[PDB]
Amino acid sequence: QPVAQPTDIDGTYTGQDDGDRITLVVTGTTGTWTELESDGDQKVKQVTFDSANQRMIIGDDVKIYTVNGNQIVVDDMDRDPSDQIVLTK
Amino acid sequence: QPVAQPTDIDGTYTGQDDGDRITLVVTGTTGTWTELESDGDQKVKQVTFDSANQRMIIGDDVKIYTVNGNQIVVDDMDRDPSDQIVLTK
Numbered sequence A, B: 001q002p003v004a005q006p007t008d009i010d011g012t013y014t015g016q017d018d019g020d021r022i023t024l025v026v027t028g029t030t031g032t033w034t035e036l037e038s039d040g041d042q043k044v045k046q047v048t049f050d051s052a053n054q055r056m057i058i059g060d061d062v063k064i065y066t067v068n069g070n071q072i073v074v075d076d077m078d079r080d081p082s083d084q085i086v087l088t089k
Ligand SMILES: [Cl-]
Pocket: A006, A067, A068, A069
């Protein structure tokens, strides 16, 4: 039951996940997902966006994403509400 | 470095993986990946095809796929040659 997403979503979205700042840079159908830890280290993962099936892969972890204007909402596959991450550009 | 794949690849592809028969049924941008074990049980996983980034997700495992006419070649992300699966319709 995937809802297809807008295909043009270029930009830089930020938000929080477990107190770490997330920065998602999107270009075309790919991007980078960067997690800033409290000590200043960053973890950078490659992202790919599958717009027709509403899937975003970061590194090799599969998420569901939803685009609402400047906001991208990232969910686990089970849609666990406590794992939801909202990013905004 | 993803090469974009043809978007119309409907059909039923079969092959082998570790002596199990794989049957991949593709419809639009989704499909089912079925593994037949030697005892007759089957394992069925949902598949999604991301054509622009050349990614296929089965269940929640990420693969790279390549379409050559009636043949679909499925690779691990590291492209380990011993993990390659060739399916044909
Ligand atoms: Cl939108």
